[PDB]
Every structure is written in C-alpha cells, then in structure tokens.
Amino acid sequence: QPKLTIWCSEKQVDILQKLGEEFKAKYGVEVEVQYVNFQDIKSKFLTAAPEGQGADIIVGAHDWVGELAVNGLIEPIPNFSDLKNFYETALNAFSYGGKLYGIPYAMEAIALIYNKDYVPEPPKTMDELIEIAKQIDEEFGGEVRGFITSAAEFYYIAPFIFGYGGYVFKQTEKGLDVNDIGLANEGAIKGVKLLKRLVDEGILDPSDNYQIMDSMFREGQAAMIINGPWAIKAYKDAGIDYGVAPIPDLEPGVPARPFVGVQGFMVNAKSPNKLLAIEFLTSFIAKKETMYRIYLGDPRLPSRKDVLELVKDNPDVVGFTLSAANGIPMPNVPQMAAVWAAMNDALNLVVNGKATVEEALKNAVERIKAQIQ
Known about the structure:
Layout: E1 3-8, H1 13-27, E2 30-35, H2 38-48, E3 57-61, H3 65-70, H4 88-93, E4 95-96, E5 99-100, E6 103-108, E7 111-115, H5 126-137, H6 154-163, E8 167-172, E9 175-182, H7 186-200, H8 210-218, E10 224-227, H9 232-237, E11 242-245, E12 259-267, H10 274-285, H11 288-297, E13 301-302, H12 305-311, H13 315-326, E14 328-329, H14 339-351, H15 357-371
Parallel strand pairs: 1-2, 1-3, 12-14
Antiparallel strand pairs: 3-12, 4-5, 6-12, 6-13, 7-10, 7-11, 8-9
Helix pairs in contact: 6-7, 11-12, 14-15
PDB class: sugar binding protein
Keywords: MBP, periplasmic binding protein, Thermotoga maritima, sugar binding protein
Assembly: monomeric
C-alpha cells in the first residue's frame, strides 16, 4: 500500500483530504493528511526527517527554506509551465541557491491602512500622504494622528529602504549573496532619509511603535497607518470604516517594496515516495482551482495572480496583495537573524537625533558583516 503523508494547517485538512482521494483514484497512492501546528512542524521535521519519519509533504514558512535545503531535507521542485501564474516574490521566497524548494500558497505584507472618515481616498505618493497627514495634524489639534508607523523598527521602514534600491543580501541567479550587503547604499540612505524627514516634519514621533500605531487606529485616533492583514479584524470589530491600498509610491514610478512573508508546501528529500509527492504537489496542490479553494478555506493573500483575479471583489485583498507582489522576501537564510537588531538599533539612533543616516547605516552594516564572520 504505497502512501503519502502530509502535515498541513487546520484550514487545509478537508481540502487536502478530498484532493488526495482524487490522487488515489488517478495514481493508486493513498494520501494521509494530518493537522500539525506550524511550530511543531519545523521542530518535528528537523528531528524525524533524518530518521525516515518525516511526512512526505509539509507546510511551513519560507524562512525555513535555507536551513532545510542545506541540511538536505527538502527536495528541489523541477520547473513546470503553470509556475508562470505565481507571483515572482512568492517563488523567490521559496527559492535557494538558484533552485525552487516549494510551492507557495499564501503571502503576507504590510500596506496603507486608512480611516475613510478622515481620508476618503488614499494618497498615491508619499508627498501626498505627507500633505494629508499635515492637514489632519493641523485641524483636529493632535487628538487624531495623520500618519503612524513603527518609526524605529526595521520591518516597518523596509518599504522605504527597498523601494529606493536598498537590499539586505544581494539577490542573484545563484541565490542570496550574503557578502553583498546593501543596507547602506544610496537607495538605503535615501529611504531612511525619508523616515528622518517624516520625523523632522513632525509627522512621525520618535516614540512611535507598533502598539501606538495599532491602538490609535483601532480607537479612531489615526487617519493612516502601515500595517498588515493580521490587524484588520480588530479594526473591523471596532467599527472603523477602513480602506487598504498599497503604500504610496515613494515618488512617481518608484513603488514601496515591503518585506514579504510566504507560506508554502515543501517535499521531503528523504521520502521514498518523493517522485509521487512532487507529482501530487505540482499537478494537484499547485493548481489554480486548488489554490482558490485554499483561499476560501483560509483567506490569506494568494500566491497566484489568477487566484487574485478570482477573489478581487474584496478590496482589502487587492491592496495587500499588490503590496506583497512589489515586496522582497525576508531572507530565508540564517544570517538574517543578526540583521534585525542592528537595523532596529540604527533606526533608533536616527529618529532620536543621535546619529546621522549615513553613519547609523554604515555602522549597522559593519556590525552585520562582523556577526556573519
């Protein structure tokens, strides 16, 4: 009795069970499908897969790909034509060393979230956002914030840094070059100079952080914020008439490029059944129709362009997904772990007037290059 085991999320079980039944009828292979918590998946896969007890297909975060791939535990996915229908950044997020290592089903990035009671129509550029923030600050006498984001937090400032051509690790045809760090190039400096300008013009406060951004918008005291899909239901429950759009273009023709987190299916490279696993993954799971069902089961930003077309009657999903499509995957390699605190520290120095952008970014990249060695 040849079989495939899949560890998946709770909202995928029924879809994957039915799909596996189709697979069994076409290929004679039984598909056993099991809900496993995201946390339990990475850890149990690392310990079980080396002993031949790993599920044949798992779900997981794109962040795991570098480790899983170098340890030889997940299998490269050969190219197929239907891949043209996936967002480039979803595929890139599941790619390592110039090879694809999974089929993404969901993306996550931040975008412009705005209170329609204060901003009927969202700004198309950052200059327009700034004008609008100003008028809100200077009218409702500082009980309503015109614009809030987490000012000293790298994850929230990234869209400015990357929009202008900043980058963490250079993206090449053979993978991320961890020795080519772009967090202090001209683009990167220009992005953080934008941040600094926001603080200098009194639009952002150096104390601004996530809690303040999130609570003020929920409580009707913020016109425009930059946040992700995870926040929206508490704003919905709180009766905010909110919209979602991409982060305004930095300047004409220069989109903001936020970090993007991606969830995907991966094949066990130790599986005795990996050829059939890859067939199930590429010919069944990866299909437009299946990916659409997956979205209906758990409405996360789709990894496929043709699935977005099918669900775009929701205006939120469009604004978020367009933001994610322009974004940059959080690097899926272990050298990223050192980057966050060095960048958060740099940004902190900038917003509190302690170091110049040029200097804060040069030192952060010095600190990072040193930690990687």
